[model samples]
Target: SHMEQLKCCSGILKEMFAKKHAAYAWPFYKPVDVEALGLHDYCDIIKHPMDMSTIKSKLEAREYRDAQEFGADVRLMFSNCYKYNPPDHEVVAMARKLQDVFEMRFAKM
Candidate 1:
C-alpha cells in the first residue's frame, strides 16, 4: 500500500517537473534520492491515504524546479529506517522500484 502511494506520488512529482519545464523552460538538472523520497512522509500521507492530485497541486506552486524537487524531497526525507534493519540494501531496493516506475512512465514521454 505504501509502495502504491509512493508510486503515485512520484508520478505526480514527475508531472509537476514536466509542466514546470514546459511553462518556463528552465535548465534545471538535479539527481533525485529516490529511496529517501519514497519512504518520506511514510506515516502521515501513506497511512492517511493521500492522492497524487494534492501532491501535484502543491508542486505546481513552485517557481523553481529545485523548489519543486525540494518539496518532493522534503516529503520523502523522513522515513522509518528502523523498520528496515539493513539500511543500505533497503535503500537500493527502494531506488530500483522508483526507477522502474519512472521508466514505465517516461517510456511513453
Candidate 2:
C-alpha cells in the first residue's frame, strides 16, 4: 500500500528526482510491483553505495554500449540528491516520515 500512497504523493518527489541534473528517474523505478515491495523499488538501492554496485553490475552485464550513459545517470541522481533542499541531518528523517505515511495509508489497502 505504500505504493498506493506514493501514487498520491509522487508529484513533488518525482519533480525533485527530475531536477536540473536529470540523472535518475525515481519515478521510472517506482516499483515495477508496488504491492510486492521489491528491493529495487527503494530509495536505499539508488542512494549511494548500492547504486554504485547496481550500476557496476549493469555495466558488467554489458547492458550499455558505453559508460557515458551509466555515469551520467549516476551523476544525475546524486545531483538530484544534492539539490533536494533538505538539511543533511533531516533528509533521512523527512524521507522516513513520508515512507511511514505511505505505509500507514496503504496498510488497509
Candidate 3:
C-alpha cells in the first residue's frame, strides 16, 4: 500500500539522519584511524547500513507505489531536520550531500 511505502521510507529517512549523527558524534570521544578501520573502503559500499535490505525487503513485503508520498515525506524530513538543528555550515553541507546520495536510492521506489 502507498501508506506502507511512505511509512517505510520515512522510517528509513529517519534512520539515515540518526545514523549520520551517530557516526558524526563517534569521532569526538573515540577517534580511530580511518584507513585502519577500513572506512575508506566502506565508503564505497554506499548501502544503507540501518536496514541493509530496505529496498528489496520493502518491495517483497509490499507492492511498489507511486513516488509522490515517499518523496514528500523525504522532503519534509530533510527540511525539518535541516531547519531545526542547524549544524555548522560545513557539517550541514556534508550531511546534505550524504542525504542527497541516500535519497537517490529511493528514486525507483
Candidate 4:
C-alpha cells in the first residue's frame, strides 16, 4: 500500500522542515514584507511567493499530495528568491545553500 509512501515520505518532510526551520529561521520563515522592505513591485516580479511559514501552514493543513509536491513548493520558494535577488545578495546566498541542503536530502529519498 502506498500508504507506506506518505508514511515514510511525510516523515522525511517533517524532519526536513524542522531541521530547516531550526537553522534558517529568519527571512524565509515568514512572507516577504513588500511594504516594510519597500519593494512594492515584489508581487509583480515574483508572481508566486512562498515562504517557510506558508509551507508549514500548508503542510499542517495537509494540502500537499505527497513529498514530491512538498518539495516543489520549497523549490518554488527558492526560485522566487533567486529571481528577486542577485547571487551576491545574502538572502539569495542563504537560499542557495538551503536549496542544496533540501535537494541533497530530497535526493536521498
Candidate that would win on TM-score: 4
Q: Each prediction's Cα lDDT score? A: 0.41, 0.41, 0.47, 0.75
Worst 10 residues of 1 by lDDT: 23-32
lDDT of 4 by residue, 1-109 (tens): 4345446555654655675455653677789989998998798899999987788788778787877777789899999998988778888877876777677767775
Residue 71's lDDT in candidate 4: 78
Candidate 2, pairs of clashing residues:
23-76
Please report how far candidate 1 places residue 89 from its true position, in Å. 2.0
**What TM-score does candidate 4 reach?**
0.80
Candidate 4 wrong stretches, greater than 4 Å: 1-25
For model 3, state the Cα shift of residue 26 in Å.
Answer: 10
Candidate 1, 1-109: lDDT as tens digits: 4334445545645653565333321111233333666755545433422223444544455422543343444334223222322556654454344434444554442
What is candidate 2's lDDT per residue for 1-109, written digit by digit as tens? 4334334333333333444423333322332232474435345434433233344455556554533454354455444434443556453444344444334533443
What is the number of residue pairs that collide in model 1? 1
Candidate 2 wrong stretches, greater than 4 Å? 1-50, 83-109
Question: Candidate 4 — what's its lDDT?
Answer: 0.75
Error of 4 at 37 (Å): 1.2
* Model 3 alpha-carbon miss at residue 48, Å: 28
Give the least accurate 10-residue stretch of model 2, judged by summed lDDT: 25-34
The clash numbers for all candidates, in the given order, read: 1, 1, 0, 0
Supply the TM-score for candidate 3: 0.35
